[PDB]
Coordinates of C-alpha atoms and ligand atoms in Angstrom, one line a residue:
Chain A
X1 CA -72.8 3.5 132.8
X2 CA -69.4 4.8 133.7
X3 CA -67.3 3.1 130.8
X4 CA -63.9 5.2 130.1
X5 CA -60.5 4.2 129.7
X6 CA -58.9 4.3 133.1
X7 CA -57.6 1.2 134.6
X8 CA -61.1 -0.1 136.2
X9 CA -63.4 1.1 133.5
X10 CA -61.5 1.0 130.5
X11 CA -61.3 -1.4 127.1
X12 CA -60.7 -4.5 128.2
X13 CA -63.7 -4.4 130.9
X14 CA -66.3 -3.3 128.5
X15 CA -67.4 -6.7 127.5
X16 CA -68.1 -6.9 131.3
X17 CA -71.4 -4.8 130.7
X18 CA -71.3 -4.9 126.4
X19 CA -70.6 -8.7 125.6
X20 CA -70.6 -7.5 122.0
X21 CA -67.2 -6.3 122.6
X22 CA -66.3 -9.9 121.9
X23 CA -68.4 -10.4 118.8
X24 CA -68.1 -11.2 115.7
X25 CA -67.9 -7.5 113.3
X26 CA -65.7 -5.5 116.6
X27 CA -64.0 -3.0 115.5
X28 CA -61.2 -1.3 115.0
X29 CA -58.9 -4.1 113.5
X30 CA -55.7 -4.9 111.6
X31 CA -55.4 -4.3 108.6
X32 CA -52.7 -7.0 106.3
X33 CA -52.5 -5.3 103.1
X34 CA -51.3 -8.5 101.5
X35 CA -54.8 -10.0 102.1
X36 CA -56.7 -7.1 100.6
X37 CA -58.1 -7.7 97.5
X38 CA -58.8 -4.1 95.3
X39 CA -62.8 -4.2 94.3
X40 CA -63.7 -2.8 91.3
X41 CA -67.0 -2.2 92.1
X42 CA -66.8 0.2 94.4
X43 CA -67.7 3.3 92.9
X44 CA -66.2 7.1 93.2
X45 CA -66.5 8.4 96.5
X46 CA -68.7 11.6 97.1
X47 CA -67.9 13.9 100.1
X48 CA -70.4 17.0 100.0
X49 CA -69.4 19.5 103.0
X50 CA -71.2 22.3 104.1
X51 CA -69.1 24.4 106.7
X52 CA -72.7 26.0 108.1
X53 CA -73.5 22.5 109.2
X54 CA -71.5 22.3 112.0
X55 CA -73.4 23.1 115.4
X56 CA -71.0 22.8 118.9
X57 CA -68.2 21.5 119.9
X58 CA -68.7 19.8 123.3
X59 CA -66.4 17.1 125.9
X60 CA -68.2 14.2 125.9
X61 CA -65.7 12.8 128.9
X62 CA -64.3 10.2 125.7
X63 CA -63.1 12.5 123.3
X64 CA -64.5 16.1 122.1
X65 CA -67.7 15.7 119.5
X66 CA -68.2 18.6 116.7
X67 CA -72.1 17.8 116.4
X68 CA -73.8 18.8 112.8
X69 CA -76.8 19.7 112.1
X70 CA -78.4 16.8 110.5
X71 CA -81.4 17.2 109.8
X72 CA -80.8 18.2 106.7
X73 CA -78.7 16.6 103.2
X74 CA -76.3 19.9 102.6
X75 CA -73.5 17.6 104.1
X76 CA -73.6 13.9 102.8
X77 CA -71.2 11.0 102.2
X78 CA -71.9 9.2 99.1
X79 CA -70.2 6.6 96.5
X80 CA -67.4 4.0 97.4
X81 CA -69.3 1.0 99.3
X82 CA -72.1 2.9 100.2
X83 CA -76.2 2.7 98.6
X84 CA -77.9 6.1 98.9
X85 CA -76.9 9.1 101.0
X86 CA -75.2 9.0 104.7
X87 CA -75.5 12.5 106.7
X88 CA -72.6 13.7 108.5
X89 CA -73.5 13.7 112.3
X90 CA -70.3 14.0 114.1
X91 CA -66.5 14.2 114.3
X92 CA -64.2 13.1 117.2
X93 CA -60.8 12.1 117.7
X94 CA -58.9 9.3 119.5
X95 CA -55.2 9.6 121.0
X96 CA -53.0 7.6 123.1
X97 CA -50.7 8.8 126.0
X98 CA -47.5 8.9 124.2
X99 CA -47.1 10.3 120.4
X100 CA -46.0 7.0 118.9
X101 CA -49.0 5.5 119.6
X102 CA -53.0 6.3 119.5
X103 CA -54.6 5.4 116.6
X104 CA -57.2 2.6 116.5
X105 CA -56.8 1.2 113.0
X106 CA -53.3 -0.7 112.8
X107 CA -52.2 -1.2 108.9
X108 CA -49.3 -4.1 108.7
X109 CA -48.4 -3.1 112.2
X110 CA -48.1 0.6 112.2
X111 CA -49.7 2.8 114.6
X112 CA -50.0 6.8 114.0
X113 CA -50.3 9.1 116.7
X114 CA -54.2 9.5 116.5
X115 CA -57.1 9.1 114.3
X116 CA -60.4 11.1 113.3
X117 CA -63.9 9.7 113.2
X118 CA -66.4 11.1 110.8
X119 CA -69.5 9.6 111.7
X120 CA -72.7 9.6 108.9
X121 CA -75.6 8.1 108.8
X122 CA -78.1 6.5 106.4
X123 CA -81.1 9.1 106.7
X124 CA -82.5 7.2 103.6
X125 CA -83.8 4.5 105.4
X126 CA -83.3 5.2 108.8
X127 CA -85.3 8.2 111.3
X128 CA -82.6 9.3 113.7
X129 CA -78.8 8.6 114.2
X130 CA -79.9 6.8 117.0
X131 CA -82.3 4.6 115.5
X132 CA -79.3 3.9 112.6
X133 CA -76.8 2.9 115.1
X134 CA -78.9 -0.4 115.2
X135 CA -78.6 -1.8 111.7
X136 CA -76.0 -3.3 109.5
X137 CA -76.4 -0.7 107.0
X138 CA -77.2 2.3 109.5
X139 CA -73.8 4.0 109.8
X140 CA -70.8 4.9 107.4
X141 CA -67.2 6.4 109.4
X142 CA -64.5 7.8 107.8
X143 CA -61.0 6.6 109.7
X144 CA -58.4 9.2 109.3
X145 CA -55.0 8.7 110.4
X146 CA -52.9 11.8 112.0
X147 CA -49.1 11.2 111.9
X148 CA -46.7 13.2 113.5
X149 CA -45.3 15.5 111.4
X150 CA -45.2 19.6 111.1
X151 CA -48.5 21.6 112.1
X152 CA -51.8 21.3 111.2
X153 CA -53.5 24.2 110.3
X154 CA -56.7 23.2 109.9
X155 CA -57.1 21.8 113.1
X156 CA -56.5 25.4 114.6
X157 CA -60.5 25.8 115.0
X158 CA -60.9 22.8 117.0
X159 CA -57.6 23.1 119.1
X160 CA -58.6 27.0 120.0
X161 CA -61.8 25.6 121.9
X162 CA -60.2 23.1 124.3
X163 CA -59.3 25.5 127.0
X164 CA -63.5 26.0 126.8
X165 CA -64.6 22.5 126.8
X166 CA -62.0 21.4 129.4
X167 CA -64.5 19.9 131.7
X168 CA -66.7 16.7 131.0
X169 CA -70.2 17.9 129.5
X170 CA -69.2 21.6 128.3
X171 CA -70.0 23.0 125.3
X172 CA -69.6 25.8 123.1
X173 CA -71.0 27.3 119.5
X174 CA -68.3 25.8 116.7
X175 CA -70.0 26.7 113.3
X176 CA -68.4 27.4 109.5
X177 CA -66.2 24.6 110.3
X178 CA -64.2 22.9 107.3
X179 CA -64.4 19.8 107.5
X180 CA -63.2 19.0 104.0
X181 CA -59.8 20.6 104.4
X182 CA -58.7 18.4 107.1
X183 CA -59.3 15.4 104.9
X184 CA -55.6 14.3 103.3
X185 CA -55.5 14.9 99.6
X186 CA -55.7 11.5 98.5
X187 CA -59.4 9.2 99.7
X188 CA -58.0 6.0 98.3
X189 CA -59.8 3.5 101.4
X190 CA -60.0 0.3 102.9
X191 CA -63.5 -0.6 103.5
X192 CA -64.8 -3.5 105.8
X193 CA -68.1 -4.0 107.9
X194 CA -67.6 -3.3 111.9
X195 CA -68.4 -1.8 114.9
X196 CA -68.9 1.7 117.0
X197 CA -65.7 1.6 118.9
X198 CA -66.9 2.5 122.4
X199 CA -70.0 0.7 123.6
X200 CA -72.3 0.0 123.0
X201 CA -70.2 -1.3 120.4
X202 CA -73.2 -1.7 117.7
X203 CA -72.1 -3.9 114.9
X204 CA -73.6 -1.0 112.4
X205 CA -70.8 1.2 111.1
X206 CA -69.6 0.4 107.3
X207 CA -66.0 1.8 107.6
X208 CA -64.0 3.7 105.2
X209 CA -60.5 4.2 106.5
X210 CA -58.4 6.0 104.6
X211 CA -54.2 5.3 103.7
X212 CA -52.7 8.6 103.6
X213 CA -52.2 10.0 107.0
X214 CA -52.6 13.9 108.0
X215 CA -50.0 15.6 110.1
X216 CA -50.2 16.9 113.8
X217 CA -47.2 18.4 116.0
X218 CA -46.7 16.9 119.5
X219 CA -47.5 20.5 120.5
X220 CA -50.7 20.5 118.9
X221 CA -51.9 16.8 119.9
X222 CA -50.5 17.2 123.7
X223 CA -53.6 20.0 124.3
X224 CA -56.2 17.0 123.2
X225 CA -54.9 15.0 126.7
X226 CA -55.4 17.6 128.5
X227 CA -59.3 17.3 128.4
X228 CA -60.8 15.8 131.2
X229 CA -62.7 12.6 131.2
X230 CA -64.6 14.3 134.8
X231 CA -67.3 17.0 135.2
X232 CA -67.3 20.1 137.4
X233 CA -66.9 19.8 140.9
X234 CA -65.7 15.6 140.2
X235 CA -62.0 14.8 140.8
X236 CA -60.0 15.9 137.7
X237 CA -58.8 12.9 135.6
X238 CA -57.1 13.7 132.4
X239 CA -58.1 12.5 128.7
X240 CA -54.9 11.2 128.0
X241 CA -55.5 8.1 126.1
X242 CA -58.9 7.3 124.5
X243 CA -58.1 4.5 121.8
X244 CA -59.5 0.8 121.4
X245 CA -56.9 -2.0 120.7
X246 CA -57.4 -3.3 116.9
X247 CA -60.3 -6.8 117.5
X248 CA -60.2 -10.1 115.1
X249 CA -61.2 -10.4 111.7
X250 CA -63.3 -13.2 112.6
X251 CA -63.6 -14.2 108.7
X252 CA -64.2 -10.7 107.5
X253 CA -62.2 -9.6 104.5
X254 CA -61.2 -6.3 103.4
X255 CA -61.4 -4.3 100.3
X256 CA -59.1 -1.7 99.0
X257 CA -60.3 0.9 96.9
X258 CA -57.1 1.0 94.7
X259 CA -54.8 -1.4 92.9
Chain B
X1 CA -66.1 43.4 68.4
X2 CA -66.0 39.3 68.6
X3 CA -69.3 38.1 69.2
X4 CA -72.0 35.3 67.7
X5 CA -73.5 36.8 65.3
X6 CA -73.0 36.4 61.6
X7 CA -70.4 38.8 61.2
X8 CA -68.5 38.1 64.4
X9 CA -69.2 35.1 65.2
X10 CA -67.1 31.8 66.2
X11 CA -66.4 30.9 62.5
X12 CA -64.6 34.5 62.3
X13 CA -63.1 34.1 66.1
X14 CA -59.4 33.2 63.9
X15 CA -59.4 36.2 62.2
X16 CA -58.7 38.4 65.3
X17 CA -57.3 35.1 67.5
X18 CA -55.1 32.7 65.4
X19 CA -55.1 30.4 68.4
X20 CA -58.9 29.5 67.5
X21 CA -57.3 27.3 65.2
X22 CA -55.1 25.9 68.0
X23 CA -53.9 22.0 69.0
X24 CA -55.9 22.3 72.6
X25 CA -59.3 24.1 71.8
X26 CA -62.5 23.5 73.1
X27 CA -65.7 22.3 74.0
X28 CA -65.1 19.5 72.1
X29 CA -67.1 16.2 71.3
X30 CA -66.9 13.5 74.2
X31 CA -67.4 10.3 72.5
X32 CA -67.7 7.8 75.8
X33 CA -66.6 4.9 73.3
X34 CA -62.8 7.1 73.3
X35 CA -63.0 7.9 76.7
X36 CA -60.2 6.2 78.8
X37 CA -60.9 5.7 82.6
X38 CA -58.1 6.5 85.1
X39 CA -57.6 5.0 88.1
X40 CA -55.3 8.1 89.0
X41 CA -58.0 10.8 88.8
X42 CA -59.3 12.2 92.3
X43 CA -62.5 12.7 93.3
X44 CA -63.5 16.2 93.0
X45 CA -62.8 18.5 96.4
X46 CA -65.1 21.0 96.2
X47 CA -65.4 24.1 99.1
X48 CA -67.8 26.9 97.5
X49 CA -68.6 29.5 100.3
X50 CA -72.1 31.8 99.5
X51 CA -70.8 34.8 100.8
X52 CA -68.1 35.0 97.9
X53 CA -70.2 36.0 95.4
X54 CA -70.0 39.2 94.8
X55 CA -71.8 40.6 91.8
X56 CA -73.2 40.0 88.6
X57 CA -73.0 41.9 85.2
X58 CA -73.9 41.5 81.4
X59 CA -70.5 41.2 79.6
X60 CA -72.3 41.2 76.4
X61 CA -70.8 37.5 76.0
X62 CA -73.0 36.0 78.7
X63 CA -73.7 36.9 82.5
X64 CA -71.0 36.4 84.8
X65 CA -71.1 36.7 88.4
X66 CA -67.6 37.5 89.8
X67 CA -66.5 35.9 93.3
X68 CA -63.9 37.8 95.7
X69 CA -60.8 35.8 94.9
X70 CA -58.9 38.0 97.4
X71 CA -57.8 34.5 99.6
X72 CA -58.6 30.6 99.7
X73 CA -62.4 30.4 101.0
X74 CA -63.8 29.0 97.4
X75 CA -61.2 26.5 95.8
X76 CA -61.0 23.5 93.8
X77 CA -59.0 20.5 94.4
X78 CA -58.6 17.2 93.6
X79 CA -60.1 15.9 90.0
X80 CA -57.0 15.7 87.6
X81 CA -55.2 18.6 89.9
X82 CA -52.4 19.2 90.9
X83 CA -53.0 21.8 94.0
X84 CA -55.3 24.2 95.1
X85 CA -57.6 26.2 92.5
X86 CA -59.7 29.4 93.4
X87 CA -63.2 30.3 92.2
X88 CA -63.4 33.4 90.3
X89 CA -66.4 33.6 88.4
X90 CA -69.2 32.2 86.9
X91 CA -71.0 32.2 83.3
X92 CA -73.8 30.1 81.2
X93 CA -74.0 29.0 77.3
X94 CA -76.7 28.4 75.6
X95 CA -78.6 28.5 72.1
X96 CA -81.7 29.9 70.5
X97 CA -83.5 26.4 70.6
X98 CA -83.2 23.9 74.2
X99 CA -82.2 20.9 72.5
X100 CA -78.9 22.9 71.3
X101 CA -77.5 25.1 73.6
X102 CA -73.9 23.4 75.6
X103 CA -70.9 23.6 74.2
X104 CA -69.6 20.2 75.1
X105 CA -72.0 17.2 73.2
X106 CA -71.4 13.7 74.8
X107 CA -72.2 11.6 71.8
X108 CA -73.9 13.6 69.8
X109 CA -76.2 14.8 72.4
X110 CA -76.1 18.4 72.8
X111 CA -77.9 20.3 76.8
X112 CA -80.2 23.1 76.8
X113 CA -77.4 25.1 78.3
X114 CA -74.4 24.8 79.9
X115 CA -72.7 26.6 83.4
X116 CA -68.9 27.0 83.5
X117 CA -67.4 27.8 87.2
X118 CA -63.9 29.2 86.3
X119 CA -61.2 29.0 88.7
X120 CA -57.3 29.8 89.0
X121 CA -53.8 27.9 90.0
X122 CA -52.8 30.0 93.5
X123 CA -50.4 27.8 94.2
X124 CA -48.2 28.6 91.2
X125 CA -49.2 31.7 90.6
X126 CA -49.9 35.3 91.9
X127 CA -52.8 36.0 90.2
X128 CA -55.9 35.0 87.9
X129 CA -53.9 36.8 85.2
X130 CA -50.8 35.3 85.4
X131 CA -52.4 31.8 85.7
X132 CA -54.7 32.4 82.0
X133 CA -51.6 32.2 80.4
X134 CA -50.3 29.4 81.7
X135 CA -51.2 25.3 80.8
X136 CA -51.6 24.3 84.3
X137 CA -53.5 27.7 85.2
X138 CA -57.1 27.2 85.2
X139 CA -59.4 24.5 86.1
X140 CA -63.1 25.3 84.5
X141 CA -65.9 23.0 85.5
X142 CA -68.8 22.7 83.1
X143 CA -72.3 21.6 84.4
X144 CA -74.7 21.1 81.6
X145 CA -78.3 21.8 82.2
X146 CA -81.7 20.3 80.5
X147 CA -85.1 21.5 80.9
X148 CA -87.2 20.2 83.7
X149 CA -88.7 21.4 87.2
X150 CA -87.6 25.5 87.7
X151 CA -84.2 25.4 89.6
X152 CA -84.9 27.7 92.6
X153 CA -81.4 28.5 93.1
X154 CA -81.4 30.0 89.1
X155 CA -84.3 31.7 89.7
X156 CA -82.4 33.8 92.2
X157 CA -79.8 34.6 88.8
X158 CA -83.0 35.4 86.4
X159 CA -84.5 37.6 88.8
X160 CA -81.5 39.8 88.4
X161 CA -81.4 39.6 84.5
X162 CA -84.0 43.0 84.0
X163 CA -81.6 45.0 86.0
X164 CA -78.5 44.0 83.6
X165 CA -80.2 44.0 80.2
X166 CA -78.0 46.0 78.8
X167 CA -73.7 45.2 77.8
X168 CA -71.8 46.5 81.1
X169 CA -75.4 46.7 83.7
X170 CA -73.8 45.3 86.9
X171 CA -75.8 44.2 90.2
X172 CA -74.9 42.8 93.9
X173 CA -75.7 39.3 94.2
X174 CA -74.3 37.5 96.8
X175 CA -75.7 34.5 99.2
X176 CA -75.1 31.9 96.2
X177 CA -74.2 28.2 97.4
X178 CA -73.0 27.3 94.0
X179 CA -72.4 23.8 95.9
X180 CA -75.6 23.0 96.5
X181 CA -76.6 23.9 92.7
X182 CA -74.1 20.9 91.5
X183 CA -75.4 17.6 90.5
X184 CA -76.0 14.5 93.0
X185 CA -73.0 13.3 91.1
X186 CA -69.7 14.3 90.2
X187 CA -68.1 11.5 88.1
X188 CA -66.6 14.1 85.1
X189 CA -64.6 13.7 82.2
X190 CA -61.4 15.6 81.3
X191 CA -58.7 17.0 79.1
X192 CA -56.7 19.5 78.5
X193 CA -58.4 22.8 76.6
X194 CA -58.6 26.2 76.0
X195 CA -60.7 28.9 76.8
X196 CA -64.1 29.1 74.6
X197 CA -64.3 32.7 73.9
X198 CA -61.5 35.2 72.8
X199 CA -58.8 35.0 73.6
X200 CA -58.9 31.3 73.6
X201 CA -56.4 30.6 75.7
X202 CA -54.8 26.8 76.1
X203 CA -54.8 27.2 79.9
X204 CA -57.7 25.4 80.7
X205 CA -57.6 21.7 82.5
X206 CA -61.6 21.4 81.7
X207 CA -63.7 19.0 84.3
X208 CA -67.2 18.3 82.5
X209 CA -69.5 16.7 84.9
X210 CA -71.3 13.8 83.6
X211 CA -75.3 14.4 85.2
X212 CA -76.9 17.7 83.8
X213 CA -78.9 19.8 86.6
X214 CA -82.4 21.3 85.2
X215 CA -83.9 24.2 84.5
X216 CA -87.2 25.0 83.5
X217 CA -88.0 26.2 79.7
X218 CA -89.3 29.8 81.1
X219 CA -86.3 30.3 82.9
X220 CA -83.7 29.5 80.1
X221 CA -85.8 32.2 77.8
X222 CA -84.7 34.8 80.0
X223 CA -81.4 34.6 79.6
X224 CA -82.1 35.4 75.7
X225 CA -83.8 38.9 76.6
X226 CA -80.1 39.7 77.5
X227 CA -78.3 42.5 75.2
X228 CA -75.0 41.8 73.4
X229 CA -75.1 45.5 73.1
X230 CA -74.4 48.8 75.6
X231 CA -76.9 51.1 76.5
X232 CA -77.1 53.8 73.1
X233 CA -76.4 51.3 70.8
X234 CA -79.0 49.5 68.6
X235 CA -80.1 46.9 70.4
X236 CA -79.3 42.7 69.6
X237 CA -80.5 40.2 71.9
X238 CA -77.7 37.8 73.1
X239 CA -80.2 34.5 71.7
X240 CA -77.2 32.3 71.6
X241 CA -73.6 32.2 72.9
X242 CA -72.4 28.6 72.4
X243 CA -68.5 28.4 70.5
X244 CA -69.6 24.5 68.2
X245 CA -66.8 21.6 69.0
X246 CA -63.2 21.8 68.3
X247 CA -61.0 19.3 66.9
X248 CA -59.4 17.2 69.3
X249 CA -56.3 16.9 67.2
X250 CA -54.8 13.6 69.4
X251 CA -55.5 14.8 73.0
X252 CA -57.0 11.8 75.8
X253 CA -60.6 12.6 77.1
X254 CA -60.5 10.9 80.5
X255 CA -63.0 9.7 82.9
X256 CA -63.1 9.5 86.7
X257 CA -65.7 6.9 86.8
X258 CA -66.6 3.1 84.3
Ligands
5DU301 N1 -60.9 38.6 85.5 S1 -61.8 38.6 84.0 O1 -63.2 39.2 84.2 O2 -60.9 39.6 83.1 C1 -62.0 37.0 83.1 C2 -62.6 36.1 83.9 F1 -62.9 36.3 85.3 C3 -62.8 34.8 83.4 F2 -63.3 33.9 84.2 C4 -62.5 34.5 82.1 S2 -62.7 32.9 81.5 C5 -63.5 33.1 79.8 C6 -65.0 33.2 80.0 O3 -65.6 34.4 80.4 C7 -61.9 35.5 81.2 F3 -61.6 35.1 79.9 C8 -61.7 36.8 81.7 N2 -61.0 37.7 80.7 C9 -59.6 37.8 80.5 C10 -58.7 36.4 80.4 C11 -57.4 36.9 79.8 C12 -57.9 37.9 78.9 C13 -57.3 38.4 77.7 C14 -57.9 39.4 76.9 C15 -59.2 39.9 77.3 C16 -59.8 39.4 78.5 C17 -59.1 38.4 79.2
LCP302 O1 -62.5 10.5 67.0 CL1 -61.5 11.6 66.4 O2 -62.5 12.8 65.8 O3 -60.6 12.6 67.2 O4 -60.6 10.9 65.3
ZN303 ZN1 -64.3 6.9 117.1
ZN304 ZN1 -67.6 29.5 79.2

């Protein structure tokens, strides 16, 4: 399929060939921090990083994906709601046109400018990332917000490859990469049951978003819409919004990880 | 020389060190009874890069393999700190028997041995020498170790332990992912301590991680083959090198997890 986020192919058509886009566990959402209850059950959470774990950086025409070698546990995502280990796979980023909007989690009606997805997967049970996608318990993300703010220097790596990956499909090497240093000082999460947020939308993906923001400069986050969502030799369309609007609840609650 | 042998050892450590007899010593005793959980504490951030090892020597005291602390590629964060601290080196305890070799003992229960990863406040200060000195300075982790399956990532440290038998024998050694070596779990407890050999310095913010990591019996022994003397002197074996627990004269043990 040719899903994206232009006018004819974007959100609000998906459901046209993914109906799950209207289901029941959709995400992103809203999130009303009056109506979050703090769960003391949730245990420490665990983030293991190894920097030689990162593969390529590639334009997947919907964002650019930093692909980790996975076949192995040197970089896993314990603790919090999770049971056993969840293997960092891949990390993208989603943006809107304009700098006061883009994120896809919305907390008591605030956007940020962007957010990073760090998507795991629970090689415990599960073969493949692919196969994982299709359970309940098969994926874990971490949602981090970027805010504007001064420069980010640890998202110098990534930024330095655009010009390389302009086009839809290319890739490049992108290895020692660290990850953990773009993470904001504090974890402190929301956690709630959801959904991929591009189709096919698979109601899999335990989400941990996180409250404190990171910073990015306009400067820095104007080179991400500059990707294009086209190949080689297509007509050039620009990358300059790739963000879901927040879906119901439906019933599902949230749970902080802090009082 | 300070040492722990009868003569020298941590019972006689005040005689040369008056702070031995300090208000913020350590190891000390966790009791988990005493232990308060906070809320507050971070999860640990650890970044341990395998290229910064460096090399590792016989101090006389223990091994200790020294990282290149030149910039920020090996740090801890998060925990109970405040800011960004860098790995400088890394040394073991243990005793003449496994069932008594750490220098922390979590009710009662004393490890076969026990790892310290040592590491320095470069946000505040300039150096690792300016930061010993200082409360906030240094952030030591301790991993305690029973005996169990051979830990192929310590075998790569005992192989090296014939070429530095004796005091001041120094070796490249490099291509250590002291990450991977840590426990599946890092819920710690911590306080505020001091260094556990001369000069015993109240610097430390000490990080003791709750799960041990094993190594085997054959493995610990070697360490014990170690000298705690120079090449031309007569020769003592470095069997044990463990300071015993320290008052805790009113500080909080914390713990990150309950
Ligand atoms: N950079 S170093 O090799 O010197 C060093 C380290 F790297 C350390 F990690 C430590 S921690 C204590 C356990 O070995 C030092 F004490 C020292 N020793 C210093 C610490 C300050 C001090 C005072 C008097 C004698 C020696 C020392
Ligand atoms: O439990 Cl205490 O030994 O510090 O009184
Ligand atoms: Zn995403
Ligand atoms: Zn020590």
């Amino acid at each position: 399929l040719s899903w994206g986020y232009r006018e004819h192919n974007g959100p609000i058509h998906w459901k046209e060939f993914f109906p799950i886009a209207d289901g029941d566990q959709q995400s992103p959402i809203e999130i009303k921090t009056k109506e979050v209850k703090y769960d003391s059950s949730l245990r420490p959470l665990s983030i293991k990083y190894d920097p030689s774990s990162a593969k390529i950086i590639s334009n997947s025409g919907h964002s650019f994906n930093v692909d980790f070698d996975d076949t192995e546990n040197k970089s896993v995502l314990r603790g919090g709601p999770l049971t056993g280990s969840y293997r960092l796979r891949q990390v993208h980023l989603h943006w809107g046109s304009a700098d006061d909007h883009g994120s896809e989690h919305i907390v008591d009606g605030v956007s940020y400018a962007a957010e990073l997805h760090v998507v795991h997967w629970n090689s415990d049970k599960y073969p493949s990332f692919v196969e994982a996608a299709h359970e309940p318990d098969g994926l874990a993300v971490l949602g981090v917000f970027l805010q504007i703010g001064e420069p980010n220097s640890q998202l110098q790596k990534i930024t330095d490859t655009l010009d390389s990956i302009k086009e839809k499909g290319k890739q490049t090497r992108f290895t020692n990469f660290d990850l953990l240093s773009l993470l904001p000082p504090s974890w402190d999460y929301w956690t709630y049951p959801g959904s991929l947020t591009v189709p096919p939308l698979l109601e899999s993906v335990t989400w941990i978003v996180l409250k404190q923001p990171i910073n990015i400069s306009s400067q820095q986050l104007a080179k991400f819409r500059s990707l294009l969502c086209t190949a080689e030799g297509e007509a050039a369309a620009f990358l300059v919004s790739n963000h879901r609007p927040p879906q119901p609840l439906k019933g599902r609650k949230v749970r902080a990880s802090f009082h």
